[PDB]
Design a protein around this ligand. Structure first.
Ligand SMILES: Nc1ncnc2c1ncn2[C@@H]1O[C@H](COP(=O)(O)OP(=O)(O)OP(=O)(O)OP(=O)(O)OP(=O)(O)O)[C@@H](O)[C@H]1O
Length: 126
């Protein structure tokens, strides 16, 4: 099992930050933690690296699990964050943007991420 760390980032308009990967799936930004990094610290870094968005962690969510196309099981730990700014795609990505919850529900590729979105919304401060 390979650990991952990422963020469910919202802006002041309560829109969520989504990214479209190389396989064309809309998901949340996440990546591998470096040795010595807390998962929260790694999530903030991955968000910045993959979307060019500076975010601040509000509170922890919960981990999701799945097996990627290469047969590797992943356990990604998520954090609710707040951020602003236009996104920037890093090499590999096929899309990125801010989305209303309604739009996200219609774009997110996986069930694990839909539930994550709803819980994040329940805990997002007004
Ligand atoms: N809930 C889910 N259910 C079923 N399949 C899911 C899924 N989520 C993603 N996939 C499927 O796995 C792929 C991403 O691989 P990943 O294992 O999450 O890993 P990644 O290989 O892109 O690796 P990261 O941890 O994101 O990589 P880094 O950001 O650290 O970049 P690096 O490897 O260059 O350091 C998606 O393209 C989709 O097909």
């Amino acid at each position: 099992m390979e650990l991952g760390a990422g963020g469910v980032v919202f802006n002041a308009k309560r829109e969520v930050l989504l990214l479209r990967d190389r396989m064309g799936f809309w998901v949340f930004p996440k990546g591998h933690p470096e040795p010595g990094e807390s998962l929260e610290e790694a999530a903030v870094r991955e968000v910045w690296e993959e979307t060019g968005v500076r975010a601040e962690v509000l509170l922890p969510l919960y981990p999701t699990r799945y097996v990627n196309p290469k047969g590797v099981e992943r356990e990604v730990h998520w954090f609710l964050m707040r951020g602003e700014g236009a996104p920037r795609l890093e090499e590999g990505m096929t899309g990125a943007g801010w989305f209303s919850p309604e739009e996200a529900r219609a774009l997110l590729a996986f069930p694990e991420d839909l539930g994550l979105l709803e819980v994040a919304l329940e805990r997002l401060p007004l």
